[PDB]
Amino acid sequence: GWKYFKGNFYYFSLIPKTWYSAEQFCVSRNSHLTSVTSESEQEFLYKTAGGLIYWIGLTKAGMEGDWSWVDDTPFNKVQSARFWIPGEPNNAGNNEHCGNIKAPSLQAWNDAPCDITFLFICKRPYVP
Template identity: 35%
Template sequence: MFLILIINTFRSDFPILHLYVILSNKGKVWSCCPKNWKSFSSHCYFFSTDSKSWSKSEEDCSRMQAHLLVINTKEEQDFVIEYRNCSCLLYGLSDPEGSNHWQWVDQTPYNQSATFWHSGDTNDTKEHCVMLNYQRGRWGWNDVLCDGVQRSVCEMIKIYF
């Protein structure tokens, strides 16, 4: 037996659906994502429909208590490719100093061996942000100008109960 209580709240123009589940069996764990977000593994993903610069996209994600997408596995990237709503998406990876020192927005350590760059695509000294796109027959990462506008993906940890 359990009781479900649903409460809608609003934070900075972003509605968050809170689902509270009170269980008689304390061993169960429930999780959910906000409305209009997609669920994969232990995270929730929001696919934007507006094209914005990298910094504006990260600001939008922050307002939703999230951050631009951080890719940790090929399975996660495959999930994003499956649910994408356009041909390219901004990621939460950047090289702010232009010194080929790539950083994830959530401070996850950058691991060169766990990346999906298109061949030769980290070679432009003016391109300090990253997007996913399809070229030469495969999906991969491409460095791009940070002030260029693209759609993006926000990511947050699932809400657990």
């Protein structure tokens, strides 16, 4: 069920999991929760998400609680500022240290508690 898009395969899960359990699942399938590095990729993901909520690879790292990608793609605060839902990230309840795709828009991302279960998206490079 992996969907191909610009050099990567993507798995849109059918079963919801917490952020970390989702990441463990992706890792067991030789992948990671997806990073998002372009407008075209953001568009691919939110459109494929079809209005439902999916964990992606967004999580806090380091002392300052800066956002990061679990697949180790460097997180670009400038280029990503446009990808959040207006008002996000808001660290609502001071317990929102992971990120998902929530809205079908370029402004798609919400930070939510890592322990909430949602569907999730894995990303795996195509290597020939």
